[PDB]
C-alpha cells in the first residue's frame, strides 16, 4: 500500500565473530599495582606556579584506563606452522579479568564552606518568603552509592545535559538559564560522574559556582549512555558492563537564590501577611549513599569473558581495551595531625594543621585466550565493509605497502654519536595517537602464560580440568 516496507530488508548485518575459532594457547598478564594519591575536592596546587602538588585523582571521577596489549599476530609462540598470513590472522580475546581494589572502606568526603542553603524543608521549622542576601552555609556531603564498571575497546559514549539552545531561540531569560538539552559525547579520563542532581555540566550551569562541593563546581558530569552503545549493531563501545547503585534523600533542603520561575499565585487562596507571601520553591534533595558493606562489592571477583554480552564477543581490534571504573566506596580519606613547627606548650589549632590525603589503589589481573581468524577473499570483502581500518593495521594481507621505501638518510638526531650537534633543538613532533587522556597500562612486557600460578590463573585452570587440578582453590572450607 505505502508499500514501503522497507524493501525488504535492503542490507543486514551478520554476527561479528562466527568464523573466529579459539585456540588452546593462553597467555596471562597482571599489573604491578597502579598508584595515585590525589585529593578529591580540588588539585592542590603550587603556590606561585600553575603545576600540581597533589592532582585531583579520586574514585568519584571516572577512571578510564587505556590498556594496550601485545601484537598477537607476531608474538612469541611455541609451535605454529599452520599459519598463512593471507588465509588467517590472530587476535587476542581476554577470557577473564579480576580488578583488585586494595583500598579499605572509606568514601570520598567532599564539601563546600559555602554550599547554597536557605532553609530546612524535610520536616521544616520556620517560614521565609523570597530569599534575603547571603544564604550559604558550611555543609559537607557524601555522594550516592555508585559502582559500575564497563569494558570496551573503543571509547565509550556518555550522555550529559549540556548547554543547549540559546536565550534568543526560546523565550527563556538569562537568569532562567539557556535550556538544558541532552548533548552526548565520549567519556574522558578525569571527567566527573553523575551527582544525584542529574548528570550535567556545572561550569556554566552554576553562575554562583559554589552551590555544590568544590570538585563538581566546574567540569562536565556524565552518566553512561547505554542506549547508543547497546543498540549499536557492532557493539565495540562496550560489550561488558555491571553496576550496583542506590541513592536516598538524607534531607530535603531549599537553595538560596531568588525565584526567577513562574508560580501562578492564583492557585492558592491568600493568607495574611507572611502566609500571603511566596516562599522559595527551589528545593533540592541532598543524596546520601551511607551504609557501606563489603557484600556490595562488584569488584574483586573474576568475570570469565569466554563470551561477552555485547554484539562483539570481546575479540580485540586495534589491540587495546578501555576500562572505566567509578568506585565511591573505596575512595577513603585519611586523617593525622601535623605540626607546622614546634612551639606547643599546649594543643593549638594554629599550629596543628590538619591535611587530608586520598589513596587510590588499582590492580588488574588478566587471562587471555589466543584466537585465530579464518579468512578468505569473499570473507575479507565483508571485513573491509564493516571496518576498513582493522585489515589495514594488521597488514598481513593486503597492502598498505610494506615498506620500503626509504629509511634514510638520515633522521634523527643527526648527529649521534658523539654529538650533541647542534644539540639539536627541535625538530618536532614524532608521533602521538591520543585525542583523549587515559591512564596508560602497558601489557607488552607483563606477559606471562602460566595458569598453575597467578591466583586468577588457578581458578581458571580448576574450572576447566586436567592438566591440572587440584592446584586450589576450590575451598577455602568452610
Amino acid at each position, epitope marked *: 500500500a505505502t508499500v514501503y516496507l522497507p524493501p525488504v530488508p535492503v542490507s543486514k548485518v551478520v554476527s561479528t565473530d562466527e568464523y573466529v575459532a579459539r585456540t588452546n594457547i593462553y597467555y596471562h598478564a597482571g599489573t604491578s599495582r597502579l598508584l595515585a594519591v590525589g585529593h578529591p575536592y580540588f588539585p592542590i596546587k603550587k603556590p606561585n606556579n600553575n603545576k600540581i602538588l597533589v592532582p585531583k585523582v579520586s574514585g568519584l571521577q571516572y577512571r578510564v584506563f587505556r590498556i594496550h596489549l601485545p601484537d598477537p599476530n607476531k608474538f612469541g609462540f611455541p609451535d605454529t606452522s599452520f599459519y598463512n598470513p593471507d588465509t588467517q590472522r590472530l587476535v587476542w580475546a581476554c577470557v577473564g579479568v579480576e580488578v583488585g581494589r586494595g583500598q579499605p572502606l572509606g568514601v570520598g568526603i567532599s564539601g563546600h564552606p559555602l554550599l547554597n542553603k536557605l532553609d530546612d524543608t524535610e520536616n521544616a521549622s520556620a517560614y521565609a518568603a523570597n530569599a534575603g542576601v547571603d544564604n550559604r552555609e558550611c555543609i559537607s556531603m557524601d555522594y550516592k552509592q555508585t559502582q559500575l564498571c564497563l569494558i570496551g575497546c573503543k571509547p565509550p559514549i556518555g550522555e550529559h545535559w*549540556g*548547554k543547549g539552545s540559546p536565550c534568543t531561540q526560546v523565550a527563556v531569560q538569562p537568569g532562567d538559564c539557556p535550556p538544558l538539552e541532552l*548533548i552526548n*559525547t565520549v567519556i574522558q579520563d578525569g571527567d566527573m560522574v553523575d551527582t544525584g542532581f542529574g548528570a550535567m555540566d556545572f561550569t*556554566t550551569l552554576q553562575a554562583n559556582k559554589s552551590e555544590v562541593p568544590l570538585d563538581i563546581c*566546574t*567540569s562536565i558530569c556524565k552518566y553512561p549512555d547505554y542506549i547508543k552503545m547497546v543498540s549499536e549493531p557492532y557493539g565495540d563501545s562496550l560489550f561488558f558492563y555491571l553496576r550496583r547503585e542506590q541513592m536516598f534523600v538524607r534531607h530535603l533542603f531549599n537553595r538560596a537564590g531568588t525565584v526567577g520561575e513562574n508560580v501562578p499565585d492564583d492557585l492558592y487562596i491568600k493568607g495574611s501577611g507572611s502566609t500571603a507571601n511566596l516562599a522559595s520553591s527551589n528545593y533540592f534533595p541532598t543524596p546520601s549513599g551511607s551504609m557501606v558493606t563489603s557484600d556490595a562489592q562488584i569488584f574483586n571477583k573474576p568475570y570469565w569473558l569466554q563470551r561477552a554480552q555485547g554484539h562483539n564477543n570481546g575479540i580485540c581490534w586495534g589491540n587495546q581495551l578501555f576500562v572505566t571504573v567509578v568506585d565511591t566506596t573505596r575512595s577513603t580519606n585519611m586523617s593525622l595531625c601535623a605540626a607546622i613547627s614546634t612551639s606547643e606548650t599546649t594543643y593549638k589549632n594554629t599550629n596543628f594543621k590538619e591535611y587530608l590525603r586520598h589513596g587510590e589503589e588499582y590492580d588488574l589481573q588478566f587471562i587471555f585466550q589466543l584466537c585465530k581468524i579464518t579468512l578468505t577473499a569473499d570473507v575479507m570483502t565483508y571485513i573491509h565493509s564493516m571496518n576498513s581500518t582493522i585489515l589495514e593495521d594488521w597488514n598481513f594481507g593486503l597492502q598498505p605497502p610494506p615498506g620500503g621505501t626509504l629509511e634514510d638518510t638520515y633522521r634523527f638526531v643527526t648527529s649521534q654519536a658523539i654529538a650533541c650537534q647542534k644539540h639539536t633543538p627541535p625538530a618536532p613532533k614524532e608521533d602521538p595517537l591520543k585525542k583523549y*587522556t587515559f591512564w596508560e597500562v602497558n601489557l607488552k612486557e607483563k606477559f606471562s602464560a602460566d595458569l598453575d600460578q597467578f591466583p586468577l590463573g588457578r581458578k581458571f585452570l580448576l574450572q576447566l580440568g586436567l592438566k591440572a587440578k587440584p592446584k586450589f582453590t576450590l575451598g577455602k572450607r568452610k
Partner: antibody
Framework: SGGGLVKPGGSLKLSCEAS????????MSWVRQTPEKRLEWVASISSGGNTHYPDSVKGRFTISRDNARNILYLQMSSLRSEDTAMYYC????????????????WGQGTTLTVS | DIVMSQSPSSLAVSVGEKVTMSCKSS????????????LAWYQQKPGQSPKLLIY???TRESGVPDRFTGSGSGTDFTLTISSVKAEDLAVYYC?????????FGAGTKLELKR
C-alpha cells in the same frame, strides 16, 4: 592586548579579556594572520585545561586561562621573525545538535613584530 | 597535519552570478563511525575579521543569508553563493576541526565586476 615591537629571541605576553558572555562556558582560541593573509592556528586550551599546539610554536608559546578574572593568555618565547603577525583571540562553540565546532566570535587583533 | 586546498585562488563576477568554490582536504573529514563532516567556512571582508558562515559542512549559522550553501562530504567540499550581491566581496576560507592541528585553507578571493 599586548603586541608591539620585539627583537628575535625575545619574549612577549598577550592577553585577552572577555565581555558580554559566560567565559567559563567557552573554549577560547588563538589564531594569527601572516602578511600572506591566510589564517594560521596558534593554540587552543580546553575548559579542563588541556593545551594543544602546532609544531610551529609548540615548545615556545604557552596558552593559559585565568578562570577567576576571565583572561586568556598567550606567553610567547624565543620569538622568530616568522612569528610576525596579527594575533587574534577567539571562541569556540560546540553545537550539540550536529556534534560540531566553530569560531563564533574573535577580537580586532593585536600586531606582533619580531625585528 | 591535514592540508586544506582551496580553489580557485580568486574569481571576479558581476552582481547576480552564481559562484562555487572548492575546498579539498588531504585527509578525510568524515568520521566513519557517525557520518559527520568536520568542516567550517568563514568570510573575511576587507579590513574586517573572518565571520562564520557554515559549520558541520552544511549547517548555516544564524544571520547568514540563505544564498550561502555549504555542501560536500569526505574530502571534497563546496561553498555556493546562489546569486552574488555587491557586499559579498571577501576572502572565503574553509577550516577543518576534525583533528589537531586545526587547519585553514588558502582562501578564495571574490571580487565584483561592474
Amino acid at each position: 592586548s599586548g603586541g608591539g615591537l620585539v627583537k628575535p629571541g625575545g619574549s612577549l605576553k598577550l592577553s585577552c579579556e572577555a565581555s558580554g558572555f559566560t567565559f567559563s562556558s567557552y573554549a577560547m582560541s588563538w589564531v594569527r594572520q601572516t602578511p600572506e593573509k591566510r589564517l594560521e592556528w596558534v593554540a587552543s586550551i580546553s575548559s579542563g585545561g588541556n593545551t594543544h599546539y602546532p609544531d610551529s610554536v609548540k615548545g615556545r608559546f604557552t596558552i593559559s586561562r585565568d578562570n577567576a578574572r576571565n583572561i586568556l593568555y598567550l606567553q610567547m618565547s624565543s620569538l622568530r621573525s616568522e612569528d610576525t603577525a596579527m594575533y587574534y583571540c577567539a571562541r569556540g562553540l560546540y553545537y550539540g545538535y550536529d556534534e560540531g565546532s566553530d569560531f563564533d566570535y574573535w577580537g580586532q587583533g593585536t600586531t606582533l613584530t619580531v625585528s | 597535519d591535514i592540508v586544506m586546498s582551496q580553489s580557485p585562488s580568486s574569481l571576479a563576477v558581476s552582481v547576480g552570478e552564481k559562484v562555487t568554490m572548492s575546498c579539498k582536504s588531504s585527509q578525510s573529514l568524515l568520521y566513519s563511525n557517525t557520518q559527520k563532516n568536520y568542516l567550517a567556512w568563514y568570510q573575511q571582508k576587507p579590513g574586517q575579521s573572518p565571520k562564520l558562515l557554515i559549520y558541520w559542512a552544511s549547517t548555516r549559522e544564524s544571520g547568514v543569508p540563505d544564498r550561502f550553501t555549504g555542501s560536500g562530504s569526505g574530502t571534497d567540499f563546496t561553498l555556493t553563493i546562489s546569486s552574488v550581491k555587491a557586499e559579498d566581496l571577501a576572502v572565503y576560507y574553509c577550516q577543518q576541526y576534525y583533528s589537531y592541528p586545526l587547519t585553514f585553507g588558502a582562501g578564495t578571493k571574490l571580487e565584483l565586476k561592474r
